[PDB]
């Protein structure tokens, strides 16, 4: 699964977010074209050059996050559709992180952020009219991990580009809570990269024993959030068989004397119809004891 | 501080041609747009051309489309419009302003938009013989 | 995109709750704007963003809207305003409202 650790379309700019080149630069944008006011950020200092633009995040607990994914959807101009952008216009936005103990805020150091990569649309928004009359959305996604501090910052570099950022998710992958094999597995965070991240083990379901010579239940979580490779599973007890996910007691007329999931077993010859949820058979009137011997 | 000022009126003749000139003040017109709003005798208003000097682009109503030309002298935070072919119906009273630009449709300065908030005060063309 | 009004004009007295719509024939975004231009003199802001007070212009301007129909309203009434009022679509054309006469009682 997906816990979800920041999202731009929830709150007024997520009611935050710097603009380190004081007023002018970046700019918190926003349409009301329904009843469902839309904030985005944007810059379009094209025709000037030099452009040191910066938007920094809000700090955003870490929490038990491991590795982080950012989900970004924007829209870039053409870079070309505007005459004068002579020698001053680039298309493409650098991706930047910084690592926090403490929430600091309005105090962006420009020095302290290391990079992630620099991302750049797969589709150019190209229109007549100057307002630009329709819309491109880009989607691309990077991470990155392991994380150490309490928080993070996330931050955004121009150079001078036409972007119109509409929203930013930052996300880690979970383990969703298992509970095939007759074992209750609980849900797990995810990894770095390449692990084989916390196997965690699973709960024997009610009247499920693993049996005397098994191995435990064991589900390896990995990075992507799913569960992998199930080793080792716990069984139905005896007088009791697999039902769906659960063990259940023999029906009237049935036993489960072998602890396992398989199916009740029938009454074997010349036995008392033997009772509900039953182990190893009663013998029979008169019937000693597999058939009672006769 | 913020300040809008016209001049350049008068009386020209039929088809003649004029330059009127809004001078800027207390804003720098790099960061919005000028308008150009005329009002006829007894009418309402009607927009009639605009300028993104920062940018570049332009924009014309069809009733001056071709005849009416807008510029920006960047340097002197000056915008011009240039008047051919006056005609008698072109009469009206010459009025400059500005706004943001917003580059994304229907997208509007949440920080810096104020929809014509500064206004200049009315130059008239006479259109007459 | 056609904008329209009406009334085209209106006479009240002092103290009256006054409206004036402007229709916006077609979905001209939602930004919006009200003005008011006095007969022979400079126009002032009145209100923008379709609800937002121009800084200093008195509490009674108000900006409601049902659709496309942007329009404007007045408390009651004090020393200044009556005018021919103006309304003015915040999309690209520009294009400002045709007016409307208003009118004090005496």
């Known amino acids: 699964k997906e816990v979800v650790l920041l999202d731009f379309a929830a709150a007024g700019g997520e009611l935050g977010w710097l603009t380190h080149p004081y007023g002018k630069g970046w700019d918190l944008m926003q349409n009301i074209m329904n009843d469902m006011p839309i904030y985005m950020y944007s810059v379009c200092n094209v025709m000037s050059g030099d452009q040191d633009n910066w938007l920094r995040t809000n700090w955003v607990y870490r929490g038990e996050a491991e590795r982080i994914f950012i989900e970004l959807k924007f829209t870039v101009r053409d870079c070309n559709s505007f005459p004068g952008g002579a020698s001053s216009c680039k298309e493409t936005f650098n991706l930047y992180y910084a690592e926090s103990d403490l929430d600091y805020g309005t105090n962006f150091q420009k020095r302290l952020f290391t990079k992630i990569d620099t991302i750049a649309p797969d589709e150019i928004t190209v229109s007549s009219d100057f307002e630009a009359r329709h819309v491109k959305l880009n989607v691309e996604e990077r991470s990155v991990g392991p994380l150490t501090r309490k928080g993070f910052y996330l931050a955004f570099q121009d150079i001078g580009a036409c972007v119109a950022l509409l929203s930013v998710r930052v996300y880690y992958k979970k383990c969703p809570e298992l509970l095939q094999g007759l074992a209750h597995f609980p849900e797990t965070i995810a990894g770095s990269d390449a692990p084989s991240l916390a196997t965690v083990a699973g709960t024997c379901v009610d009247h499920a024993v693993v049996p005397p010579g098994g191995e435990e239940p064991r589900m390896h979580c990995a990075v992507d959030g799913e569960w992998l490779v199930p080793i080792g599973q716990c069984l139905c007890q005896a007088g009791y068989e697999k039902v769906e996910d659960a063990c259940q007691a023999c029906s009237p007329g049935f036993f489960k004397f072998e602890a396992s999931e398989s199916p009740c077993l029938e009454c074997p010859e010349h036995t008392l119809p033997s009772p509900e949820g039953a182990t190893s058979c009663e013998c029979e009137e008169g019937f000693f004891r597999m058939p009672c011997t006769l | 501080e913020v300040q809008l000022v016209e001049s350049g009126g008068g009386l020209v003749q039929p088809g003649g041609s004029l330059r009127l000139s809004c001078a800027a003040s207390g804003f720098t017109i790099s960061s919005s747009y000028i308008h150009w709003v005329r009002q006829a005798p007894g009418k309402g208003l009607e927009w009639v051309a605009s300028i993104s000097s920062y940018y570049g682009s332009t924009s014309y109503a069809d009733s001056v489309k071709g005849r009416f030309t807008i510029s920006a002298d960047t340097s002197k935070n000056t915008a011009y419009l240039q008047m051919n072919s006056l005609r008698a119906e072109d009469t009206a009273v010459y009025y400059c302003?500005?706004?943001?630009?917003?580059?994304?449709?229907?997208?509007?300065?949440?920080?810096?938009?104020?929809?014509?908030?500064?206004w200049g005060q009315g130059t008239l063309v006479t259109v007459f013989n | 995109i056609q904008m329209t009004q009406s009334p085209s004009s209106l006479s009240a007295s002092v103290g009256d709750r006054v409206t004036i719509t402007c229709r916006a024939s077609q979905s001209v975004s939602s930004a919006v704007a009200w003005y008011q231009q006095k007969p022979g003199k400079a126009p002032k802001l009145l209100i923008y963003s379709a609800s937002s007070l121009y800084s200093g212009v008195p509490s009674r301007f108000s900006g409601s809207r049902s659709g496309t129909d942007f329009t404007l309203t007045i408390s009651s009434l004090q020393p200044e305003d009556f005018a021919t009022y103006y309304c003015q679509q915040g999309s690209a054309p520009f294009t400002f409202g045709q007016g409307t006469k208003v009118e004090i009682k005496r």
């Open positions: 302003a500005r706004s943001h630009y917003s580059v994304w449709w229907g997208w509007h300065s949440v920080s810096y938009y104020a929809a014509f908030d500064y």
